[PDB]
Amino acid sequence: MIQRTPKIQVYSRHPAENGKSNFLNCYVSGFHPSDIEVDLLKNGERIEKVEHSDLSFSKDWSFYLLYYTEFTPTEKDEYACRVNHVTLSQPKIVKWDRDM
């Protein structure tokens, strides 16, 4: 029995333009087991109606999920992905950085 901590990427479907409707994605990969918690945050509060993909895994048997919600970015609104997993003692927050 293996346990793998996930990798976390938070990004937009298209290059973010203030006032242009876009999609916010949290892509989590390389984790085992499958049970995971993924929430998308706006100004620290969790975003409701976040969709996610059907559970799949790669060649090394580690799972990947895409969590996504449509959003319209602004200059000063802050967004993040918060993932909790068995490998993570405390919830992991990865902030959304539109250049990185």
Binding site: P33, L66, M100
Partner: protein, 273 residues
């Protein structure tokens, strides 16, 4: 080349009901069907628009095979728990990957049938489709059982017949979209990191298929020993995203080139900041 894949996960949840069974099917990098045991009326459903014209016969046979496999996995998870002399209350996982690859001729290059238990290799069918690879001692018990029961011939008959025959049919259903490429739209960004060094990130956006090669070079020489690479990520529209980054001395930006390989690009790209 083209591929057909199914990714099947069965996770027992002792005390929370019957194990959770998911099988998700792909042609290349495009998901086309899914079955989830926890859905409404659990059944195989189209996950691509080119699948929605399939008749009730196709869906009922697919749904029936998923329900047969669901019972097979609950039995297999219980059998594996005895094999490993595991206690009764833990959650455990079986995973199964199967499908086929075809070439330019669209005939079978390789068929897959392999399992993982609890995230680790358990048993895999070899490329001959005649022999098994057991990962460990519990899987040698399994290998002895399937060799005596001629299980390999049973999967081989599917892989050489139905898997290729239906994968070619899927290429017809989605021909306008499955056979397309989207060449990456690539750019290099610049971010200062110290008073001494800078991060140069090579971007690739809006590309299908998922396969891509990004390399940084200095004076014609791979800088992959200094590269930070993320996994290729899905945009959510059927395309993918990736970047490669190098950290370089201030004032040295124009000595570095990023190279982009993709099935949409007859020649690889060369970009500079």
């Amino acid at each position: 080349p083209h591929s057909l894949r199914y990714f099947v996960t069965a996770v027992s949840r002792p005390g929370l009901g019957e194990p959770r069974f998911i099988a998700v099917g792909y042609v290349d990098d495009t998901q086309f069907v899914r079955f989830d045991s926890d859905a409404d009326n659990p059944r195989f459903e189209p996950r691509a628009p080119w699948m929605e014209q399939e008749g009730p016969e196709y869906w009922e046979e697919q749904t029936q095979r998923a329900k047969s496999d669901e019972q097979w996995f609950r039995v297999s998870l219980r059998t594996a728990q005895r094999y490993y002399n595991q206690s009764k209350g833990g959650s455990h996982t079986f995973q199964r990957m199967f499908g086929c690859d075809v070439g330019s001729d669209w005939r079978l290059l390789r068929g897959y049938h392999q399992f993982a238990y609890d995230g680790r290799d358990y048993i895999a069918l070899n490329e001959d489709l005649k022999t098994w690879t057991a990962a460990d001692t519990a899987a040698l018990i399994t290998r002895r059982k399937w060799e005596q029961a001629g299980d390999a011939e049973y999967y081989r008959a599917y892989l050489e017949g139905e898997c290729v025959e239906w994968l070619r049919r899927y290429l017809e259903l989605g021909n306008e979209t499955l056979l397309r490429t989207d060449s990456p739209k690539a750019h290099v960004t610049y971010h200062p990191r110290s008073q001494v060094d800078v991060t140069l990130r090579c971007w690739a956006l809006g590309f299908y298929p998922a396969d891509i090669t990004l390399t940084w070079q200095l004076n014609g020489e791979d800088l992959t020993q200094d590269m930070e690479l993320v996994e290729t990520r899905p945009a959510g529209d059927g395309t993918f995203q990736k970047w490669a980054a190098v950290v370089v001395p201030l004032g040295k930006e124009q000595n570095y080139t990023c190279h982009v390989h993709h099935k949409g690009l007859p020649e690889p790209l060369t970009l500079r900041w």
